[PDB]
C-alpha cells in the first residue's frame, strides 16, 4: 500500500497540507449556524441558480441521523465522504448502544476522522469544515464546527467557508442568547447576507427544533429576506 507521509511539519511548526486544506475551505460556499432557545438554524449559500440544475430540491444541508444535520464548506466530494462516514457511524452507534448518538459524540467522531487524515500516511486531509447541529434526546440543542485539522468546538453561532471571519465578527456584535425560532432564522439570514449577494435563490436554510427538522420553502424564506434587506439600509 502507498503510505508515504503527506502531512508533515515544515520548519516553523506548520502542517502545510492542513493549512492548505483550510485554504480549500475558505474558497467554499459560506454556511452559518445559529443556536436559539429551542432551535438550531443552519443556513448555507447555494452556488447560484442556473436554469439548468434540477428544479427538484437538492439539499445542501445533509441529514446525518434523525436528530443531526450537517452543513459543510470545502471540497464537495470530501464532504460527501465524511458525511457518509458520519451517517454510518450514527447507525453503528444506535446498533451498539440502542440510544441515539448525542450530537457531541457524532461531532467528535467526525473530527477524529478529520484528524486521523492529517496523520495517515498515504492520504491527504479532508478539505472540509463542517457545521453540525441538532438536539440530544433531552431537548438540549447543539451547534458545532469541525475544521480540517480535526478540531471541533461548540458555538452559539458560527460561520464557515468564504469570509467566515467577516461573518463571525458580525455575529459577535449582534448575537443574543435565547432567540426565538423566528429571530434565529432572521439572524442567520442577516449574517449570511454579509457575504452572499442576493437572498433570492442562493440561500438554503434549515430549522431544527426538538424532533422536527424543516427547510424553509423558497416563499417563507423571501418574507425573511425582505424583512432583513430592508433592515440593512439602516
Amino acid at each position: 500500500s502507498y503510505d508515504r507521509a503527506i502531512t508533515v511539519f515544515s520548519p516553523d511548526g506548520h502542517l502545510f497540507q492542513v493549512e492548505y486544506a483550510q485554504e480549500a475551505v475558505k474558497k467554499g460556499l459560506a454556511a452559518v449556524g445559529v443556536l436559539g432557545s429551542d432551535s438550531v438554524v443552519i443556513a448555507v449559500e447555494k452556488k447560484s441558480a442556473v436554469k439548468l440544475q434540477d428544479s427538484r430540491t437538492i439539499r445542501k444541508i445533509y441529514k446525518v441521523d434523525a436528530n443531526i444535520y450537517l452543513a459543510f464548506a470545502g471540497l464537495s466530494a470530501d464532504a460527501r465522504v465524511l458525511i457518509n462516514k458520519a451517517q454510518l457511524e450514527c447507525q453503528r452507534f444506535s446498533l451498539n448502544y440502542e440510544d441515539t448518538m448525542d450530537v457531541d459524540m457524532l461531532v467528535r467522531y467526525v473530527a477524529g476522522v478529520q484528524q486521523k487524515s492529517t496523520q495517515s500516511g498515504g492520504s491527504r486531509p479532508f478539505g472540509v469544515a463542517t457545521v453540525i447541529g441538532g438536539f440530544n434526546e433531552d431537548g438540549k440543542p447543539h451547534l458545532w464546527k469541525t475544521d480540517p485539522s480535526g478540531m471541533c468546538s461548540a458555538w452559539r453561532a458560527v460561520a464557515i467557508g468564504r469570509h467566515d471571519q467577516t461573518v463571525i465578527e458580525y455575529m459577535e456584535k449582534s448575537y443574543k442568547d435565547g432567540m426565538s425560532r423566528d429571530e434565529c432564522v432572521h439572524f442567520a439570514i442577516k449574517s449570511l447576507l454579509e457575504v452572499v449577494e442576493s437572498g433570492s435563490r442562493n440561500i438554503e436554510l434549515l430549522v431544527l427544533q426538538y424532533k422536527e427538522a424543516r427547510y424553509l420553502t423558497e416563499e417563507e424564506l423571501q418574507k425573511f429576506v425582505v424583512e432583513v434587506e430592508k433592515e440593512r439600509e439602516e
Partner: protein, 229 residues
C-alpha cells in the same frame, strides 16, 4: 519540504520532524503545572477565537482518570488522540490490576504512542502535562513529541513557556500550599496571556493529595482564586 524524509537526522543529531513538531508547541496556548505536597495544579489559557464559542467545548484540561488530568498545548486534535490512549491505558490498568494506574506509567503509555511515526505519518504536535496523585503522592510529568517524558515540579508549555519558566524560577518552592499554587498558576497566566485574564478565558484543575481526586474549577471557583491577588 518533502526533500528530507521524516525519519531523518539533522547534522546536530536531532530528528527534523521532531524539532518542527516542537516549534508547533510554541504556537500553542500556554498551559502549566505545579506540584505541591497538597496536590497538583494545571492551568490553561483557553485562547478562544470568538465570544461565540462555548468555552467548555475548548477544553484544554482532560480527565484521564479520577486521579489524573492532562493539559495539552499545540494541536488540540492531536491531543485528543493521546488522551484517548491514556484513558484507555489507564482503564486497562484498572481492569487488569484492579488499582489506579500510576501517573508515570500513564505518561509512559502516552509516549508509547508518540514513538510511532514513519503507522503515523508524522509526530503529534502536542506537549502534555499530566498531573496526578498515586502512591508516591502528587506528580507532574510532561510528554514531548520526541516521546520523552520528564517528571517536573512546575512546568509550562506554549507561547508562555519561556516567560513562565522565569516566574517559576523566582516564586516556586517545593513546599507551597495548594492555594499558593493555584495563585501562582493564575498569576503566570495573567502575565503571559494575550487577552485579559477572566474566569472563562482560563481553565484550572487540581488533583488534591488528600482525596487523590481531580477537581475542575468552575468559573466561580476561578474567580475565588482571582479574588486574592
Amino acid at each position: 519540504e518533502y526533500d528530507r524524509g521524516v525519519n531523518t537526522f539533522s547534522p546536530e543529531g536531532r530528528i527534523f520532524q521532531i524539532e518542527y513538531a516542537v516549534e508547533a508547541i510554541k504556537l500553542g496556548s500556554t498551559s502549566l503545572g505545579i506540584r505541591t505536597p497538597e496536590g497538583v495544579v494545571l492551568a490553561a489559557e483557553k485562547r478562544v477565537p470568538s465570544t461565540l464559542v462555548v468555552p467548555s467545548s475548548m477544553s484544554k484540561i482532560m480527565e484521564v482518570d479520577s486521579h489524573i488530568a492532562a493539559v495539552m498545548s499545540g494541536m488540540v486534535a492531536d491531543a485528543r488522540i493521546l488522551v484517548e490512549h491514556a484513558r484507555v491505558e489507564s482503564q486497562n490498568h484498572r481492569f487488569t490490576y484492579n488499582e489506579p494506574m500510576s501517573v508515570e506509567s500513564c505518561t509512559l503509555a502516552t509516549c508509547d504512542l508518540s514513538i510511532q511515526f514513519g503507522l503515523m505519518s508524522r509526530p503529534f504536535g502536542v506537549s502534555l502535562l499530566i498531573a496526578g496523585v498515586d502512591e508516591k503522592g502528587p506528580q507532574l510529568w510532561q510528554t514531548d513529541p520526541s516521546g520523552t517524558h520528564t517528571r517536573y515540579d512546575a512546568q509550562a508549555i506554549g507561547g508562555g513557556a519561556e516567560a513562565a519558566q522565569s516566574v517559576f524560577t523566582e516564586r516556586y518552592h517545593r513546599n507551597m500550599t495548594l492555594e499558593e499554587g493555584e495563585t501562582l498558576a493564575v498569576d503566570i497566566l495573567k502575565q503571559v496571556m494575550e487577552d485579559q485574564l477572566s474566569p472563562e478565558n482560563i481553565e484550572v484543575a487540581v488533583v488534591r493529595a488528600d482525596d487523590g481526586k481531580l477537581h475542575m474549577y468552575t468559573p466561580t471557583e476561578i474567580k475565588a482564586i482571582m479574588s486574592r491577588m
